Amino acid sequence: EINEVVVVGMARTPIGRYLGGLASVRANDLAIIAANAAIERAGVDPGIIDEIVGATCLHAGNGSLPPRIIGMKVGLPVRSGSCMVSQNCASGMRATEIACQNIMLGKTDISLVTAVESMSNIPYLLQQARSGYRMGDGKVQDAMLSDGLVCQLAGGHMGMTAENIAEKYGITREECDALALTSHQNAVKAVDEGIFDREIVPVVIKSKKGDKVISKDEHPIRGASLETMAKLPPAFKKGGVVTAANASGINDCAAAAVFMSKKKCEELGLKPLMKLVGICSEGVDAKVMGLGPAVAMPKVLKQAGWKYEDVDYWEVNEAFAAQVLGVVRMLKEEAGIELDFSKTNHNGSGIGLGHPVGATGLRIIVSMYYELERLGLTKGGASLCVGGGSAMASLWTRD
Amino acid sequence: EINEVVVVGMARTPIGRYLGGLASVRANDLAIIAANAAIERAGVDPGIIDEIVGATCLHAGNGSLPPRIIGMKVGLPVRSGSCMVSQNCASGMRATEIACQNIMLGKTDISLVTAVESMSNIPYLLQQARSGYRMGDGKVQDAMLSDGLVCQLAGGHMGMTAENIAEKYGITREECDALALTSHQNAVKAVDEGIFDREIVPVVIKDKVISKDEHPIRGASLETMAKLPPAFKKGGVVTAANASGINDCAAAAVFMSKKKCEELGLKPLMKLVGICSEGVDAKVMGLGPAVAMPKVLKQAGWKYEDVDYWEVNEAFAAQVLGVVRMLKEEAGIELDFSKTNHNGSGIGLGHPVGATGLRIIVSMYYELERLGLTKGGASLCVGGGSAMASLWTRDI
Amino acid sequence: EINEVVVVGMARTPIGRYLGGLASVRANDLAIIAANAAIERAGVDPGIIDEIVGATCLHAGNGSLPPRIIGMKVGLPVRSGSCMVSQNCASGMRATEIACQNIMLGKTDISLVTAVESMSNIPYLLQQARSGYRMGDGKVQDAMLSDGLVCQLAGGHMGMTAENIAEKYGITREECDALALTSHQNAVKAVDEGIFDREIVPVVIKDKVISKDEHPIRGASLETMAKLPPAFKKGGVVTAANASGINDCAAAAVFMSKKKCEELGLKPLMKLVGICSEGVDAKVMGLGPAVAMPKVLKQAGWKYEDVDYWEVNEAFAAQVLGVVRMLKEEAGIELDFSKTNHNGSGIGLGHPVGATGLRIIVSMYYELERLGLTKGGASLCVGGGSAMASLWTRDI
Amino acid sequence: EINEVVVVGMARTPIGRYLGGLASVRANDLAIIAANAAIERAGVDPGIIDEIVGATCLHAGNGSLPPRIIGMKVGLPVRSGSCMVSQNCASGMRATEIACQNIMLGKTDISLVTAVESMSNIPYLLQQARSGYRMGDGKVQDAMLSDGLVCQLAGGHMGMTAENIAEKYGITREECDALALTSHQNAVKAVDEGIFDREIVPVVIKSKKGDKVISKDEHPIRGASLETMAKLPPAFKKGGVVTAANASGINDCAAAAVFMSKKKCEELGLKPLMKLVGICSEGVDAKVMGLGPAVAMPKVLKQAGWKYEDVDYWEVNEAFAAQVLGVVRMLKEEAGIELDFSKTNHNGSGIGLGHPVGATGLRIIVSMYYELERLGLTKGGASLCVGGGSAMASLWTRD
Secondary structure: OOOOEEEEEEEEOOOEEOOOOOOOOOHHHHHHHHHHHHHHHHOOOHHHOOEEEEEOOOOOOOOOOHHHHHHHHOOOOOOOEEEEEEOHHHHHHHHHHHHHHHHHOOOOOEEEEEEEEEHHHOOEEEOOOOOOOOOOOEEEEEHHHHHHHEOOOOOOEHHHHHHHHHHHHOOOHHHHHHHHHHHHHHHHHHHHHOOOOOOEOOEEEOOOOOOEEEOOOOOOOOOOOHHHHOOOOOOOOOOOOOOOOOEOOOEEEEEEEEEEEHHHHHHOOOOOOEEEEEEEEEOOOHHHHHHHHHHHHHHHHHHHOOOHHHOOEEEEOOOEHHHHHHHHHHHHHOOOOOOOHHHEOOOOOHHHHOOOHHHHHHHHHHHHHHHHHHHOOOEEEEEEOOOOOOEEEEEEEOO | OOOOEEEEEEEEOOOEEOOOOOOOOOHHHHHHHHHHHHHHHHOOOHHHOOEEEEEOOOOOOOOOOHHHHHHHHHOOOOOOEEEEEEOHHHHHHHHHHHHHHHHHOOOOOEEEEEEEEEHHHOOEEEOOOOOOOOOOOEEEEEHHHHHHHEEOOOOEEHHHHHHHHHHHOOOOHHHHHHHHHHHHHHHHHHHHHOHHHOOEOOEEOOOOEEOOOOOOOOOOOHHHHHHOOOOOOOOOOOOOOOEOOOEEEEEEEEEEEHHHHHHHOOOOOEEEEEEEEEEOOHHHHHHOHHHHHHHHHHHOOOOHHHOOEEEEOOOEHHHHHHHHHHHHHOOOOOOOHHHEOOOOOHHHHOOOHHHHHHHHHHHHHHHHHHOOOOEEEEEEOOOOOEEEEEEEEOOO | OOOOEEEEEEEEOOOEEOOOOOOOOOHHHHHHHHHHHHHHHHOOOHHHOOEEEEEOOOOOOOOOOHHHHHHHHHOOOOOOEEEEEEOHHHHHHHHHHHHHHHHHOOOOOEEEEEEEEEHHHOOEEEOOOOOOOOOOOEEEEEHHHHHHHEEOOOOEEHHHHHHHHHHHHOOOHHHHHHHHHHHHHHHHHHHHHOHHHOOEOOEEOOOOEEOOOOOOOOOOOHHHHHHOOOOOOOOOOOOOOOEOOOEEEEEEEEEEEHHHHHHHOOOOOEEEEEEEEEEOOHHHHHHOHHHHHHHHHHHOOOOHHHOOEEEEOOOEHHHHHHHHHHHHHOOOOOOOHHHEOOOOOHHHHOOOHHHHHHHHHHHHHHHHHHOOOOEEEEEEOOOOOEEEEEEEEOOO | OOOOEEEEEEEEOOOEEOOOOOOOOOHHHHHHHHHHHHHHHHOOOHHHOOEEEEEOOOOOOOOOOHHHHHHHHOOOOOOOEEEEEEOHHHHHHHHHHHHHHHHHOOOOOEEEEEEEEEHHHOOEEEOOOOOOOOOOOEEEEEHHHHHHHEOOOOOOEHHHHHHHHHHHHOOOHHHHHHHHHHHHHHHHHHHHHOOOOOOEOOEEEOOOOOOEEEOOOOOOOOOOOHHHHOOOOOOOOOOOOOOOOOEOOOEEEEEEEEEEEHHHHHHOOOOOOEEEEEEEEEOOOHHHHHHHHHHHHHHHHHHHOOOHHHOOEEEEOOOEHHHHHHHHHHHHHOOOOOOOHHHEOOOOOHHHHOOOHHHHHHHHHHHHHHHHHHHOOOEEEEEEOOOOOOEEEEEEEOO
8 A cells, every 4th residue: 555655854945036136046056955954954864865856847047857966966876766847836746746656656765856946047048049040030038938927828927817817706906905915014024033944944145255145035025005005007917906016926946855755754763744645736727727726725625535624724825916816716606615814824925925936836835834833733735826727735734 | 456557549750850850840739749649549538638747858948838738739628737747868758657656546547648859949048148148258058958968967968978888888889880770770671661650640741741750870881880970079989870869759648547448448558567767877877777677677576588578768879788788797687689679769760858758668569569469668768867667568 | 633543353252042052151251252363363462452441231240340351361461451331232332432532542552342241141139138138038130131131211121112112103013023034034144154254253162162153043934923922012013033132242352543553564454433322212212223323424424325334233123113214204314224234133143232332343344344345334222222323444 | 633621510429338327328329419419510401411421330230221320310311322331449530531531522512420339239149040050059149249349360359459569568567557547537537527518419318207318428437546456457368467447448429520521611601610631541460459559640640741749639549558558659669759648638538438439439539629629729630549450540620
C-alpha cells in the first residue's frame, strides 16, 4: 500500500518587487538559497536526497534543466532524480504533488521540491531570429507576457479574466478596493511585526562597495486607504474594476521544501512538521480561471473526507480582488461553503505580498504551515487559481 | 488496490530535420496532430480525458502553458488538469510516469501525454533587454544551446560528455563511426520499408504534407564517416554523423486504468510494468542507462533476458559504446543488439529532445506488435545525468 | 580658373539579388572590389588620392565611417579626406557632385567616389534596447524599410508614391506591365550578350565567383506580368515585377582635374558638364527627374536633343510613365526611349539604392563607348523627393 | 568666379547628458528645434531655402533621409535639395563645407545646415536577423560603439587612440587631469554665468503632469578639483592616462546654421554675421587621429593666407586631454605654432561640455562666432580631430 508523506523542512526568500531588491538575483540562485534553508532546517544530509522536483513558470534564460543545477549545488547526489514542472501559478503545488506521489509509491524516500520565479530576469524572445525575419518588422516579445501572463485561450492578460469574473458576478470597484486594502494592510502588519521571519531565509546582495541583505517582503503598499485605492485608474480595461493595487503584483521569490515518507523521517530521527492529507487539480474555463479554487477546494476535501469547517487555516492566493470575491460567490452558490475570512489569509496574500507565479504554489503552503505553528492549530489547506484554469488545492495536518 | 495502467493509443509525427520539412509548424500544432492521432487510435471521446501531461524541453515561445492549449484544442474538458514537465531528453518519459502515477493512485482515470520538440522554432533570447544594455555589446543567445544542449555542470555541449565517456573507456572513433553507420543504414531501411508508417501520423502543411522521417544520412559509407571532422573537441571521436541530430517531432499517448478501458469497451495495447529515474555524474550523463535499466528491472522483478526488445536512444556513438560496457563491467548485462534498436535510433533517426522520451516508447510498442513479441523496455540518457527507463507488457 | 573635372576610371560589381549571390559579401568589401577596379582602370597610384567620398543609404552595421576603411584598404594616404553621404537613391550621384566640386575649387586634385548598398546585409534595429523595454512587447525593425524604403513624409513605402503618380496621371497597369517587360527583356538580352562585361568587376567568394547581373526575370511574358498581385495598395498598379528590386552592388570612380590627368599622363574618359539637384513633393517623388533633367540642361546650355544617350533609373513602371508625361506637359520634352535605357534599368536590373546614383553613371559611359557616342546624361528620382541629374561629355 | 559665403543665423540646443535631460528627444526633433532657431534668427522665409545639408554620425533609427524630414517640417520648399553627410566628429563641419561650396559655385543661394547627434537614442543592431543566426549565439551590438566610437583601423575605442598620443609624446596623467579640470571649471563658469544663453535655443520636454525645459549644458562636473581628478580609475586601458573626467563625454545636441551668398543676403536686407574664409580636411593615421587638428589648422591657414596669430579666437574641440596636449606638441614641433590658450576654448570644450559627435563639428563654429561677438573680435577659427583621421579646420571673419 501507499506510504504516508510528511514535510520536514520549509523555507522561502522574501518576495521582492518587480525590478526591485532581488532583481540582481537570478532564479537559480534564489532557488539555491531557499533549498539550502529547507535542507538545513530539516536536518537531512543533502547527499541522500533522492530527487529534486523543480517548479517554475518561465524556464527561459536559466540554463539546462535548472533544477539539476540547483540540486547539485545544494549537494544532492549525482544519482538523484531531477525534473522541471510547470502549472503556471500552481507550479510549486504540482511539484509538491509529483514528489509526494513518488514517495507514496516507494519510488523515493526523500524528495526536494523547489519553486522559484525571478520575473525581474525573464528574458525577451526573438522568435524569427533562427530562420530570419527575411523582410519587414517583427516583434521582440516580453516572455513574461507572451509565455505566461497573456493566455491565448483567454484572449488577453490575466487581468482580463478577472474582469470577466467581476462582470459575471457583478463585482464592483468598491468591493474590490475594500478587500484589496485589507491585504495591503494585513501584509504591512505582518511584515513589520516579523510574522514572516521564521519562514524567510534572507537573500544577500554581494555589492562591490558593501553587502546588502533582503529579509522583508517589499510589495505591500504602505499607508493604503480606501480613498487612495479609488484614485488609481483601470490597469487592463477601460472602466475596468481591476487596478494595480487590487491586482496581484509581479514579483521575485523562491520557496523550497523537503518531503519524506513518514517511516524514513522516523529512521533518521527527524521532526515531521506536517503530513500530506490531500492534493489534486481541477480546472475551469480559461476565461474565468480565477474561479478554480471554488472547484478545487471542495474536491480535495472530498478526496480526504474533510468538511470545510474542519480546516483550521487556509492560504487562498488572491490573484485579483474580483477573482477572490468571485470564489466567495461560487463557493456559496455551487458549493455549500461560506468562505471563512477569519481563518483565511491572515497576513495578506497575492494582492498585498505579490505573486511570483512559479514560487507561489509552494509559497502559500510554506506560509500556511508557519501560521498553523504560530497559532497552535492542526489542520491547514492551501489552494490557488491557475492561468488556463487547471487550479489546485491541498490539505495538511500537524498530527 | 493500486490501479493497473495500460496504454490504449499512441501516435507520433515524422522526425523532421533541423530547419527542414517541419520547420514551419510550431511545437503546439505538432503536439495537436499527434494527440488527435493517439486519441482516435484509442477511440476515446476526448471530452472525458481527465488531464494532459505535456513534455517539452524548451517552452520558450510556445505561449502560456502549451499543454493546456493543446488539451483544449483536441477537446479536453475545461475541468481537466494540465501541466508541463521537462527532464531534458527524458521529458516524454517523465510525463508518462507522472500520468501513470496519477492513474495508479486513482487521481485520474484517463490521462493524455504529449511530448514535443520543435527545435527549428526555438527562439533566441535577449537577457538584458528588460533592464537595458545601457552601453556596450550584448548577447543574442540561442536558447536551444544555452537553455538545453549546453550544460553548465558538464562544462560544455552534450557532445563533450560523449567525449568524456570516450576517454574513460578509451573508445576510438572507428567504433563510433561503425555503430553510427549501422544506425543510419537501419533507419534508411526501415523508412523505405514503411515500418514506421503504422506509428506515424502525417503533418499537413497549409498544401504539402510530411510523412517520412528525413534525418537518416543516405548512402552512408564506412569511409564517408571517417572524413568528417570532429564537432565538439580537438581530435575528438564525436562527429555530426555519429552524434544524434537536431530534429522536430511530436508524440502522444492516451493512458488509462485497466478498469476504465474495460468499462469503456476499448482495447489495451500494453500495460505499464516499471518506470523510474536514476542519475550519473553530469560529465558522463551518457552512461545513465547503465544504472536506470538494471534498477527498473530489479524494481519489476524482471531480468534483462525477460525483455524481448529494447528502444535505447543513441545520443552519441561513444555514449552507446560506453553504455554497452558499463553494463558489462558494473552490471551483469551484455547488451543484446539483436533485441535493441532494430530500425535506427537517435543517430540515424534524430533526437527531438522533448519528444524522444515518449517517442521511443511509441516505437518500442509498434516493433513489439510488428514482431509479435510481448515484453518491451525503453531507456535513455539525459542532459544533466538523471536518466530514465521503463518496462511494458502486452500481456495485460 | 575653375578646374575642369574628368573621370579617368569607373567600375561596378554585378547587381546581386536580394539575399542572393552576393548576400555573403558585406558592403565594405563590395566597395573595396569596385574601388580597386576603378583605380587600376584609371592607372593611378592609390597613394596620391586626396580623398574618398563614399555613398550608401544604410550605414548601420558597416563600422565606423566605412569610406575611411575602404580608402585605407585600397591604399589611400592617411592624409586623405573621407566622408559618407546619403541622398537615398541618388547617394552615388551626390557623392560624385561633392568630389567634383572639391576638384572644381582646387581643394583636391584626385578624388575617389564609392557607392555601395548591400541590402542583403542591412541589420535589424532594437530601438528600446539601450534604455530597456521594462515591460511589454517591442519592435525589431527592418532598417531597410524604417530607415530607407518607408518614408514618413510620403506616408508609406516608396511603392505608394508610385501609386500616387498612377492616380495623378491615371496610368493603368497595362502600361506598367508593358514597360516593365521591356526592361526585363532588355536586361536579359544585354546580360547574355556580355554588354555589361566591360563595366563589371567580378566578386570572388572565399572559391565561387559572381560576375553576371542576376535580377532580370527570365522568360518574362506580357501575361505573367498580369497574374502577379499588387504589392503595396489594394488594387494598385504596382507589382513586384514592374517595381524596382532590392539588390546588392558597388560602383566606384576616380575623378581628377583635367590638368592632373594630363600631368600624370593618363586618359580622361569623360568630362563633367553639369550636375544638380531638384526636388518634388515627397508623395510623388517619382516625378523628380522631370524637374532635375530640364534644370541641369538649362544649367549647362544644353538642349535635351544634345544628349546622345540617357540612363534614367526606373524606380517603378508607373513612376517612369509619370516622368515621361510630366516632361511632356510641364516641360517641352518627349522622352526618347530609343536614346534612353537601352539595356534594362531599375526594374530589370534592380535598384541597389546606395549604389544606383553612381551605377547609372558607369553604365551611361560604357554605353556611350560601346556606341561611339559623345554626350551622355543620367538622372533618377529619390526617396523624399530631392532628385538629381548630371551631364557628361567624352569630348574633353 | 566663385561667390563669397556668409552665415546669417546660428543656433544650438543645450548639450545633454548621455541618457539625461534630452534622452526623450530623438535626433530629428532636436534638429528641428535648432533649425527653426537658426532660420528665425536669420530672418529668412524658410520657403526660399534652396537645400538642407544634414550632419549626423549615427543615422540608424531616425527614418528615411532625416534631413529631408527636418527640412520639410521647418518649412523648406519641396523643390529644395536634401542630403545627409558624415565625417564622424567633423560631420557638422563637412556639412558646412558641402553647403558653402554649393553656394560658392552658384548651385544654391541659401543653404540650411543641420548637425545633430542623439547618442542616448542610438539603437542596437541585430546583424544576422535578416538571414538568421541559424545556430549558436551572436552579438547584439551597441551601434554607438561598433558603428562610431570603436574604430576598426584603430583596433579599439577612441580612448585607445588618445592613449597612443599620450604614449608617443609621453603625456602623463597629471598633465591630462590639469587641463581637463580647467575645461570642467571653465564650462561650469560659462554655464552658470549665462555665456551660452545667446546661442542656445531651449528644448521643451512635454511631460504629462507638467512641462520641463532644458536650457543649460549639463555635462560639466561640478566642484572638480585636481585631487578629485586623480581619484578616477583608467577608463579604457590598464594604467592608462585617460579617464571619464579627462575624456570627452557621450552627449545629445543639435546645431543649425543658415548660409548665404553675400549678394543674396544683401538682396534680402539681412545681417551677415560672418564670412567664410576657409575650410578643408586633412587626415592623420587612424591610430593617432587625435593629432588631426595639428595638420588641418596649418593647412587652412595656408589656403587663406593667414598666420596663426591672426585668428582672434579658436574653438578646438577637446576630445581627450592627452589628445589636446598632443596637438600642442605637434603644433610646436612640426608646425611653428605655440597654441594660444589665452585665445582658445575660453568656456570649456568637449571634455567639460561634452562631445555630441555629429553635432560638434558645427557646434564649435556656432560657439566660436558668439564668443567673437561677446568679445568684439573679428577673426575666428574652428578645428577638431576625427575618428579615422580625416580632421577639419575652418576660418571665418566678421568683416
